Design a binder for this molecule. Structure first.
Ligand SMILES: [Zn+2]
Ligand SMILES: [Zn+2]
Lengths: 37, 455, 49, 37, 96, 11
């Protein structure tokens, strides 16, 4: 049970990083739009 | 002492048996640089390599497993205790020779790209066990180790955890070797007057109150710290020293624990022992050490069935000795150690033994070990009584094992010549059997020149 | 006698005769309970993915 | 039992602290990569 | 030559002597307040082990075991009957 | 509690 909880926490961290990874693409697109404007 | 991971999940025929191929030290890497990949700054990670190979491996500054570049022939060592699940071979791209261990921490550890296996399927391996050799299946010419950590026994990237990040946040003990034994003339504990200055337990107990922490050396209570590499060189290596077997201050202090916990938790026993030692004219430390060895560190003082030959008491009262003292072995075992000190004093008050007791620790040890004839042989032939010819139950070994529980070794004339000559080797690197190297690595210091302290 | 009692056959002949079938039944029942617990543990070993 | 409970609580607290520190380091690296672009 | 006087009423636990550095002549009283009071570095004892002493009872004389020439009294207050620094309370702050 | 720790040197 303790190992299962640890694995669940690790999966939570992995998916949090997965969602956070979109920030680079968003910033690059914002810079592209700012250059276009 | 549980080497490797010690997280609170691991807590729960006629032929000669050889010891398992287990090492006592493991490699650790501390990165103070700015080479960052997501693992927390300044953390220590335990590599699956031997501690002697810590400096010869590289972390390599894209897949789910970390690659550690190591020279060809290095041995992969299991950092956690567990059961080997499967040992197979996949020829081609991934997992050339891979071994999976179900660690007691609940996570599966996989070591791939190996050259040979040293374990078997379904074998229980302890921490520090030798697993196998590194391979070059991926890039010929350069050897490495594919290290992967999983929560399941699958074969995919779903469930993979970065080994470095995982090792950064787990509680582990990187070394299991005992600290070196030397001189503790200054590392004494008095229950009535506790020391004012203390250092972290991972320090090295140098003689005369000196210590070594984090590549810096100094004295207790002195804020001035000198560099380890500047003061301790090849000309003057780190020597833990020895305690003289015939020199003492001449006064016994009540409450002086001499590094023993039983004396600290029983101050009345310490006071009575100091009284007895002062009355006998001998140092309290010698009698303390002898009684601690003879009773397994005061855990078998009142045990009347541990010894199959009928030996009980603080100083190991034999039935003949008990009859001589006017009592029986069972009564001596029943009485508390404070009461047994009276009988110890009575036995040591023998005129065939008392005059020679003050000459050194060796005389007291001989009197307690062999009695009057051993003492007489010592007086007539000091060198003859300490012969090392076979026996294995001679007085030399008895003096060797004195003070082991607290880290004290005695330098006795006509006995320690072999210890001084054999132990006069200087190490400039890490060696597995050396306890001083393990202490140096555990203290955080680099491997400075030091004397050889094996066992 | 010691290495006989190591197995459990040091009892008198009549005692051994009277305590054979029940001893085997107890051994079988103990092993069955051990196997039931082992099967439960192995069955609970399931992946969360 | 009290000692075991205390040890478990301390381990959980240090695990949560390490996870928070790792998340902070990941966010800092993400910001550095943003500044790189 | 000044007389040490028990400020609290209690039972005397032990009256012994330790030769050397600390606790030359020390007397321990289990006060009725629940705290153990120790008076060390004495010259002579006026009480007995297991004796019930009232407040204002004469305990003993001061000694010079630590620094010969100058006499003083080692005064220590504890919540236990141990012999270490684990459980010691500053007497001045406690009596304040 | 009691004073002392398990001896790191072998017994
Ligand atoms: Zn790889
Ligand atoms: Zn004082």
């Amino acid at each position: 049970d303790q190992s299962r909880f640890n694995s669940s926490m690790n999966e939570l961290a992995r998916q949090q990083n997965y969602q956070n990874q979109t920030f680079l693409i968003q910033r690059q697109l914002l810079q592209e739009q700012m250059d276009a404007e | 002492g549980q080497l490797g991971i010690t997280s609170p999940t691991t807590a729960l025929d006629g032929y000669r048996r050889l010891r398992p191929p287990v090492v006592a030290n493991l490699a650790t890497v501390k990165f103070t640089g700015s080479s960052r990949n997501g693992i927390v700054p300044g953390s220590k990670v335990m590599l699956p390599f031997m501690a002697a190979d810590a400096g010869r491996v590289r972390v390599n500054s894209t897949h789910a497993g970390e690659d550690i570049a190591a020279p060809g022939g290095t041995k992969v060592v299991s950092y956690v205790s567990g059961q080997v699940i499967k040992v197979t071979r996949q020829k081609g791209i991934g997992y050339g020779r891979y071994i999976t261990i179900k660690g007691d921490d609940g996570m599966y550890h996989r070591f791939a790209h190996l050259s040979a296996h040293n374990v078997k399927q379904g074998q229980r391996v302890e921490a520090g066990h030798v697993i196998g050799l590194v391979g070059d299946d991926g890039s010929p010419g350069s050897y490495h180790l594919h290290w992967e950590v999983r929560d399941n026994d699958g074969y995919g990237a779903n469930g993979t955890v970065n080994p470095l990040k995982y090792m950064g946040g787990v509680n582990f003990k990187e070394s299991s070797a005992p600290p070196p034994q030397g001189n503790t003339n200054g590392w004494g504990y008095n229950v009535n007057n506790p020391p004012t200055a203390r250092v972290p337990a991972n320090a090295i107990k140098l003689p005369n109150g000196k210590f070594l922490v984090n590549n810096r050396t100094g004295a207790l209570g002195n804020p001035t710290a000198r560099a380890a590499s500047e003061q301790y060189t090849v000309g003057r290596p780190v020597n833990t020293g020895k305690v003289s077997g015939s020199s003492w201050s001449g006064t016994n202090d009540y409450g002086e624990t001499y590094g023993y916990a039983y004396l600290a938790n029983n101050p009345e026993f310490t006071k009575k022992l100091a009284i007895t030692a002062t009355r006998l004219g001998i140092s309290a430390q010698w009698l303390v050490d002898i009684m601690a060895f003879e009773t397994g560190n005061f855990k078998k003082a009142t045990n009347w069935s541990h010894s199959r030959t009928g030996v009980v008491g603080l100083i190991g009262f034999t039935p003949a000795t008990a009859r001589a003292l006017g009592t029986t072995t069972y009564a001596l075992a029943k009485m508390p150690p404070e009461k047994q000190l009276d009988y110890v004093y009575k036995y040591l008050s023998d005129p065939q033994l008392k005059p020679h007791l003050s000459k050194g620790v060796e005389y007291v040890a001989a009197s307690i070990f062999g009695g009057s004839p051993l003492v007489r042989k010592m007086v007539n032939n000091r060198s003859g009584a300490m012969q090392r010819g076979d026996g294995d139950i001679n007085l030399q070994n008895y003096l060797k094992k004195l003070g082991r529980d607290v880290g004290r070794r005695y330098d006795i004339r006509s006995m320690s010549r072999a210890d001084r000559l054999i132990g006069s080797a200087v190490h400039t690197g890490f060696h597995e059997g050396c306890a001083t190297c393990a202490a140096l690595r555990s203290s955080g210091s680099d491997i400075v020149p030091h004397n050889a302290e094996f066992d | 006698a010691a290495e006989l009692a190591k197995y459990g056959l040091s009892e008198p002949e009549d005692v051994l005769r009277k305590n054979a079938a029940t001893r085997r039944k107890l051994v079988n029942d103990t092993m069955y309970q051990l196997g039931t617990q082992a099967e439960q543990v192995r069955r609970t070993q399931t992946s969360g993915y």
